[PDB]
Design a protein around this ligand. Structure first.
Ligand SMILES: COc1nc2cccnc2n1-c1ccc(Nc2ccc(C)cn2)cc1
Ligand SMILES: COc1nc2cccnc2n1-c1ccc(Nc2ccc(C)cn2)cc1
Ligand SMILES: COc1nc2cccnc2n1-c1ccc(Nc2ccc(C)cn2)cc1
Ligand SMILES: [Zn+2]
Ligand SMILES: [Zn+2]
Ligand SMILES: [Zn+2]
Ligand SMILES: [Zn+2]
Ligand SMILES: [Zn+2]
Ligand SMILES: [Zn+2]
Lengths: 318, 318, 318
């Protein structure tokens, strides 16, 4: 049968990629057309070669790709990159997660920024964009999940068609919560709750609501994994992020609103200090808490620390 | 019937946009896919919800969009922007214009730069482009009108199919004259004639040839409305204009011809003085004469004056 | 018949282009949609109006165009530019080449960089790209020829369908050798052999292997013809080349490899000296040897010399 032929199959990347894709700080490279295969490979090692029907999976992937836009940062490359970080987390904590969670989170990551225009929730609200009237909170993130559901509903795109209805609902819910958790405004409270549950020892992965929070922190960690690459990758990626933000700052000014320094290209010279603030207030606490909860994710924190040092070095003029 | 269903319909933008689209200095925003709806809205308020069949109008709009190119300034966004300025002029002088003129000028504005390559008539002539052999004067502008007619002639694209033949010819002529008037080389003589007719009192909107001239000056004013936005929008848009011109300067140099300072990127430092020259010699006289003729268009002149002050401030180093 | 109608036909460019396209330093201009006609014109003057069936030729051209990518330098414009330099070489040495060679080399030039991603053979090897496993030497160049063959094999795309099988094989071999010769790593040995054969007088165009070498040097000369344009064109084109190389340098750094100064954007200030090195070590010897062998190609060498002077002038700060 078809599932039988698919069971005999092997999927394989070039040698260097098979070796280094297991590393947390792996970079997926500049060859766009290699990215779908990289993702299929990760799905097959982490989930199994029979979790998805291959023809369907590829059809789904190319449609997701088609629904990312050509913006400097929140693009198709970002999606696959975030998916890779989740792959590495899953592979290094491989006894903790169910099959549904594995399938779900990899898919959630690939879809997490679908149809991103390169603008924040804040700008949409101030512009008075139609999405802001429809989604009062987590505006873009609820749109990404809506986009995800639209793609699944396309003919020949339901990659979960083999699941029972009960499992289907579960996986879609895993996906929904995970995408919503990528709204950074929700991170601060989430990490705060996790830290306190961790310290007192109430934190228990057998409790669904705790488990949801931990997955949420995982999504933040993957979403921000730019700060966990080696310095040359981290510093170049920063160019892409500010290209987007500065464009939003321009648009704020066009609405007659002074944008914050983060989004203001007139404040370029103060980027290094702005990054330092970001690492101190957001990234280091993020990966510190995640390392506490999932000790094998420690390389993310180490790498984050190294980049913090590099930015300090920039500030000094060193 | 269909026209009856269309008569019950309402079209509406978000709240902020409904309010501020009436302002002369409105910016249509960075969300491209909102622009067609903005244009339909303007057509419905200024012309009426029964002037066009909606399905046809949208088909026409998307084809026009498809025939603008991806250049930094003379693009789809410019077209809708010029259309908005005409909307605001029409709404604030609402007793003067016929239905045909209203329909026509909004359509003319949307189509005024169709298939623009980002090069002036001058460069085409020097390059010896095939369009220059076909159109000895107003080369690009006669091409834009030809493009307009080709799109109308497409199946299901004749948005004026409900007009009588006599009215159809009239509207196409209104459109033709209006697009040709956007050739800035023709502006100088036109404004000169209008000024003198205005001063002596011979100017009379009941005279078709005077009326054509006034519409022509209206088209110039809309075409240049960049200089009538608030400073943050005006100054950022200037980036886009020079990106185009400097590219043309590069191409002049490749033909072995020294380009004028306007088109020469080696003269960046002298942009502020170049703008000052432009406002003094072209923009201020343009909106001054237009305000004389159509007093409600005065906010364009005020805004132009404010930007003139801003450029003086740049020159001073202030 | 159809070939008879095609025989009555004339193809013609605007006046300026008919005159200046015969010049070695001709620039094909910024109007993309003029480029196919320019190429057809060159084929018709150099080969004859009956060498190709026009409908087929155009179909082929647009498919080739479709298979070039949107990179800063190794793009569709580069392909037509390299084809033009071969045109000028062929027209000024018009008694030396067969019909097959003329057809072949113009086609080879148009296809020489098909599907170029903007990365060197070196980077592919270090990235461990699948093409590097398939093609151990001249990696990109064997890919360009493979792409060429795929396009020919498309229905209605075999522009050589009128040739006998024997002639078809010959032309494809001419094309294959010519594209492989564009691998610059092979140039150094090739020019070295040609120089020595030239000096001793063993060089003989009636010897197929010598003839192949001379064609190979011709391909290098066309491939590098950027350095043979007038200074304004040469200096602007240099921008495009470094945009590509610096991007590759970035990607080297992401692999953890320090790129050479040629590919490193941190070494911008040293570009003028880097060009000087390039002209001394590669370009001047290239066109010097070619001028020895084919004296009518002397204007390429003159122009190269003038650009060498310009770069020296840049270095001096003059
Ligand atoms: C969500 O915001 C961010 N995501 C990032 C991923 C990688 C690197 N940076 C990221 N940022 C980001 C966070 C904070 C800032 N802050 C500032 C503040 C002032 C100035 C002048 C610059 N940056 C910027 C980016
Ligand atoms: C039609 O030309 C222009 N349209 C504009 C719209 C907005 C802003 N500027 C516009 N320009 C324009 C007009 C004149 C100049 N002149 C110069 C001259 C010298 C230099 C160094 C720079 N600009 C430029 C743009
Ligand atoms: C194949 O390499 C090149 N092709 C060119 C075509 C036109 C102009 N330049 C070309 N180059 C090229 C050759 C050598 C260099 N070398 C360096 C070395 C150091 C530095 C700092 C800059 N350039 C660059 C381009
Ligand atoms: Zn997001
Ligand atoms: Zn994201
Ligand atoms: Zn125009
Ligand atoms: Zn215009
Ligand atoms: Zn090549
Ligand atoms: Zn090449």
């Amino acid at each position: 049968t078809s599932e039988e032929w698919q069971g005999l199959m092997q999927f394989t990347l070039p040698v260097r990629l098979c070796k280094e894709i297991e590393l947390f700080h792996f970079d997926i490279g500049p060859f766009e057309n290699m990215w779908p295969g990289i993702f299929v490979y990760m799905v097959h090692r982490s989930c199994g070669t029979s979790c998805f029907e291959l023809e369907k999976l590829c059809r789904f992937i190319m449609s997701v790709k088609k629904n990312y836009r050509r913006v400097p940062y929140h693009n198709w490359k970002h999606a696959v990159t975030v998916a890779h970080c989740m792959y590495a987390i899953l592979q290094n904590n491989h006894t903790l997660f169910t099959d549904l969670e594995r399938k779900g989170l990899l898919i959630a990551c690939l879809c997490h920024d679908l149809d991103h225009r390169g603008f924040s929730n804040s700008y949409l609200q101030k512009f008075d964009h139609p999405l802001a009237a429809l989604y009062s909170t987590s505006t873009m993130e609820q749109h990404h999940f809506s986009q995800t559901v639209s793609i699944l509903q396309l003919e020949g795109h339901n990659i979960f068609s083999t699941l029972s209805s009960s499992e289907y609902e579960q996986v879609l819910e895993i996906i929904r919560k995970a995408i919503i958790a990528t709204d950074l405004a929700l991170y601060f409270g989430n990490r705060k709750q996790l830290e306190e549950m961790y310290q007192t020892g109430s934190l228990n992965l057998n409790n669904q609501s705790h488990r949801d929070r931990v997955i949420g922190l995982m999504m933040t960690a993957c979403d921000l994994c730019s700060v966990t690459k080696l310095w040359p990758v981290t510093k170049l990626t920063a160019n892409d992020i500010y290209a987007e933000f500065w464009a939003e700052g321009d648009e704020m000014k066009k609405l007659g609103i002074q944008p914050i320094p983060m989004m203001d290209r007139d404040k370029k010279d103060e980027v290094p200090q702005g990054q330092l603030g970001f690492y101190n207030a957001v990234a280091i606490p993020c990966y510190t808490t995640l390392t506490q909860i999932l000790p094998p994710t420690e390389p993310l924190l180490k790498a984050c620390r190294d980049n913090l040092s590099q930015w300090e070095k920039v500030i000094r003029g060193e």
